[PDB]
Structures are given as structure tokens and as C-alpha cells.
Amino acid sequence: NATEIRASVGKMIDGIGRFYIQMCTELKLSDYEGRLIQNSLTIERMVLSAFDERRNKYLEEHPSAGKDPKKTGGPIYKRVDRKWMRELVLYDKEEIRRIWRQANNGDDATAGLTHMMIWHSNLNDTTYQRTRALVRTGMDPRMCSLMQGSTLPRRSGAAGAAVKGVGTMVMELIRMIKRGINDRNFWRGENGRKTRSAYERMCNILKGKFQTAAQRAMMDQVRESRNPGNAEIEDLIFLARSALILRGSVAHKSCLPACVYGSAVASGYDFEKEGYSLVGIDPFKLLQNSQVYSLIRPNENPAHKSQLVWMACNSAAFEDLRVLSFIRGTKVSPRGKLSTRGVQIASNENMDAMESSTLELRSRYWAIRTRSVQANLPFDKPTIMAAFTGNTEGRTSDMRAEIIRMMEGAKPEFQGRGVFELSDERAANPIVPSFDMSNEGSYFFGDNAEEYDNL
């Protein structure tokens, strides 16, 4: 029955590929322009917008975007007369829906839509900073390593929860609890009932993330509080600090851009026959054989742009760079050292100086997510100081004292990688890694990237 899931997962990868090929024909893009990752993002955004229907389920629309809510589109980049031309294309949302379902043989393929949504979330996590959003909710900016999927749409329920990190959940809870503090009628009446049911659902999702009985117990107390306030906000802050040392269980999905899937179907490949699994070597096989191009701004390093895309494709922004450097075979530097900005090109950017280069998406080894010798690496001092702080004042409980005790005695042993040679297609001989101890361990060390809430 495990190969039956591989057939269904391959069936939707086939669907994303079939759709992207039709969109390239529809937009009349050359083979090079079809492999441009900037064009792939625009095509992906149109489907999520067409099926969203202003629900904020698959993406988040601009306030301007809601000027003609029956149409969707974005920038399409073409190479004309030795220069890069940008044009704003528009299609009817009903037309885009028709083409998407047509590529999936009449089906809706909600999973195919979700797949591209998580790929966008992984790209935003690897690209943009979230420290300003943490400060608004009264959080420590040093918890940036807990923000998995913090850019997901507001109403992406089932799909988003699996990818969201502990800090992302505490943020959506603190945001919601602070909204209750203002007006007392928030949690009362018919309207209140629905919001209370979502409150208990979010608390249970976050409870499932924690893998210690003490952390789960404190989340139970927060959920049972019929009228939450500043007391629960402080408990959630404390639980966020524990997540730094006593890490929660967060799922990482390796979602590639649509152009990769499309260019593999164009050659000739039946993902429904061969099957497909996001867990093992299948994503690495596609990236080794892939050919993706990207627009590049002046004073940008195309090797750093490649690391940005390669890391987002593997959902590795929150993993140890010393492990990523071993798998990649090249130093995976922290984000602050990257001479690059977002993959997307803003509308105010000038096209005259824009160039393109080949994205380097290959790896020396491949790895399977494992959540048997193990070498465990220490946390950096900012993580240690952010975790063991603020416990000298305020609320106290038997559960807080128990959690702090587990934090102090925290063992080296969670979301690991089993490294194998590319020639070892069947995962015969696991490779014991040999880390370069001079590289930084956190992708967010000295982070200087753009803030997400800028547009």
C-alpha cells in the first residue's frame, strides 16, 4: 500500500507538470523562458489566486489585487532584443481554473495546489526576516529559528498546520489572544463560539508539536482557560523559549517549483508509473537533472542566488548549515553573508540592468529525513541566552519548574538526515558526515535580510 501512495503523489506531480507545460504554450514562452524561475512563480501564483476566491486559503492577495477580483496574473519575463522585457498578464480566474483541472484529467487536485503553496512558504522562510512581526507580538527576535511557515495564508488550515513551526503557532495565538483583550464581546455570543473552537484547535496542533509531557501539559492549561489574557500570553512566551532547547516536531516538505516538474514531464516521464516520494531521493534526482534559470540583479552573486533556491527546495532554512554544507559539497553560508535578495522582482525595479544566470541546484550527496552513530553540535550563545531568560520574574508553576529542569539537563539527542552517495540509489551504505566546524551553524546568524511585511 506504500506504493499506492507513491502513485497518487506521482499523479499530482504529473498534474503540476502537465499544467505548467500548457501555461508555457498559453503564454508563448521559449524553452529558456519556461525554465526561468521568475516566470514559474507568476504561473504558480495565478492558480492559487484562481482557486482561492478571496478566501486567503492558497495565497494572500494585495489590496490593489482586489481591483478586478474576476482576473488574476502577474509579471512575465521574456528575452527580446538582448534585453529582458517585463509585461503584466491578466487571465480570468475561471479560465485558469479550467486549464488546471484539464491538466489533472478533470480532477480538482487540491494537493497539487497545496504543493505549490508550501513551495512558496518555503521560499519566503529562506528569504525574508520576521523579527518585526515577533516584536509586535511581544516576542524575542532571537526565536527566528522557530518561524517555519510563518508566511502561510491566514486560512490554510489542514495543509499549513503540518509545516508551521512552534513559534509560528505561538504568534497566531498571541495575535488572537491580544485581540480578545481589547473587546470583551470577542469570546461571547454566536460569533465567539467559532473563534473559541479555532482557539482549541490551534492549541492542540501546537501541543502535538511538543514532544515532552511537560510542554504538552502547559498547553492544556492554556487551552482550558475559558477567558485568556496576559497570563496565557506569558505562558506561550515561556513555551516558545523551551522550543529552542526542547525542539518540537515540525514537518518539512521538499516542494520544487512548477517549472522543474513541468520540464521533467516535457521530456517524457510518467510520475504516476514510477511513483514519487518527497521523503527520499526523488527530489534530489529531479534537481540533479534539472535546468532552471533566474533573473539576477547587479551586485548579486549567482552562486548565492542558487543557494537560496536550493535551500528552499529542500526546506532546509531551519537545519544546521554544517550538515547542509556536507550534503551540498559546498559551504552553505548563513543568510547574512549572501549577496542576494528575494527571487521575485518588484514592480518598481528597473529591467534595463537585469541579467540571468544558471541556477546551481546539484548536490554531492542526497539525504532522507529521519525524525547509527550520531554526532551532536551545540547551540550558539544567542539561542542559549534567549531560552534561559525571563524566568526570574512573573508566573510560577510546577510545570514551569519541570520544563526548566528538562531544559538545563537537555541531552544532545530529531529531524535528522541520513546521507548517502548519489551512486547509492537504494540507500545501502549510510555515510557518517564529517563537518567543517568553522562554518556557522544557524542560517539566521547575523541575519540582515529584508523584512517580509514590506511590499
Tell me the closest approach of the beta carbon of residue 383 to its own copies, in angstroms.
10
Determine, following the binding rule CB under 8 A, whether residue 402 of this chain makes contact with its own copies: no
Which residues sit at the interface with Na ion, rule CB under 5 A? 338, 437, 448
Out of 60, 92, 272, 380, point to the residue binding its own copies (CB under 8 A): 380
Determine, following the binding rule CB under 8 A, whether residue 429 of this chain makes contact with its own copies: no
Q: Which does 301 bind (CB under 5 to 8 A by kind): its own copies, Na ion, none?
A: its own copies
Q: Hey, which residues between 355 and 374 contact its own copies (CB under 8 A)? A: 373
Determine, following the binding rule CB under 8 A, whether residue 450 of this chain makes contact with its own copies: yes
Q: Which does 291 bind (CB under 5 to 8 A by kind): Na ion, its own copies, none?
A: none
Tell me the closest approach of the beta carbon of residue 304 to Na ion, in angstroms.
8
Tell me the closest approach of the beta carbon of residue 448 to Na ion, in angstroms.
5
Out of 88, 90, 181, 377, point to the residue binding its own copies (CB under 8 A): 377
Out of 299, 396, 398, 426, point to the residue binding its own copies (CB under 8 A): 299
Binding region for its own copies (CB under 8 A) out of 1-9, 70-78, 145-153, 436-444 = 436-444
Out of 381, 396, 423, 428, point to the residue binding its own copies (CB under 8 A): 381
Q: Virtual CA dihedral for 253, 259, 265, 269, nearest 10 degrees?
A: -40
Identity of the residue, 267 or 423, whose beta carbon is nearer to its own copies in the bound complex: 423
Binding region for its own copies (CB under 8 A) out of 24-32, 128-136, 198-206, 395-403 = 128-136
Tell me the closest approach of the beta carbon of residue 338 to Na ion, in angstroms.
4
Tell me the closest approach of the beta carbon of residue 446 to Na ion, in angstroms.
9
Tell me the closest approach of the beta carbon of residue 132 to Na ion, in angstroms.
16
Identity of the residue, 194 or 381, whose beta carbon is nearer to its own copies in the bound complex: 381
CA–CA dist 355, 345 (Å, integer) = 12
Residues in binding contact with its own copies, number by CB under 8 A = 52
Out of 30, 191, 227, 376, point to the residue binding its own copies (CB under 8 A): 376
Determine, following the binding rule CB under 8 A, whether residue 297 of this chain makes contact with its own copies: yes
List C-alpha distances in Å: 84 to 24, 78, 281. 17, 6, 35
Out of 191, 249, 350, 429, point to the residue binding its own copies (CB under 8 A): 350
**Range 352-374 burial, b when 16+ CB lie within 10 A, else e:** eebebeebbbbbebbbbbeeeee
Tell me the closest approach of the beta carbon of residue 384 to its own copies, in angstroms.
5
Q: Which does 297 bind (CB under 5 to 8 A by kind): its own copies, Na ion, none?
A: its own copies
Identity of the residue, 114 or 383, whose beta carbon is nearer to its own copies in the bound complex: 383
Identity of the residue, 208 or 433, whose beta carbon is nearer to Na ion in the bound complex: 433
Q: Hey, which residues between 16 and 35 contact its own copies (CB under 8 A)? A: none
Q: Which does 107 bind (CB under 5 to 8 A by kind): Na ion, its own copies, none?
A: none
Q: Hey, which residues between 179 and 238 contact its own copies (CB under 8 A)? A: none
Q: Which does 3 bind (CB under 5 to 8 A by kind): Na ion, its own copies, none?
A: none
CA neighbor of 407 nearest in space, from 222, 241, 221: 241
Residue pair 293/35 in contact by the 8 Å Cβ criterion: yes
Q: Are strands 91-92 and 365-370 parallel, antiparallel or unpaired?
A: unpaired
Out of 5, 353, 370, 414, point to the residue binding its own copies (CB under 8 A): 353
Contacts of 271 by beta carbon, 8 Å cutoff, 6+ apart: 10, 11, 13, 14, 17, 264, 265
Residue type at 97 in one-letter notation: R
Identity of the residue, 389 or 448, whose beta carbon is nearer to Na ion in the bound complex: 448
Q: Which does 198 bind (CB under 5 to 8 A by kind): its own copies, Na ion, none?
A: none
Instruction: List contacts with its own copies (CB under 8 A).
Output: 129, 131-132, 135-136, 140-142, 297-301, 304, 326, 336-341, 348-350, 353, 373, 376-378, 380-381, 384-385, 388, 408-409, 412, 432, 434-438, 440-441, 446-451, 454
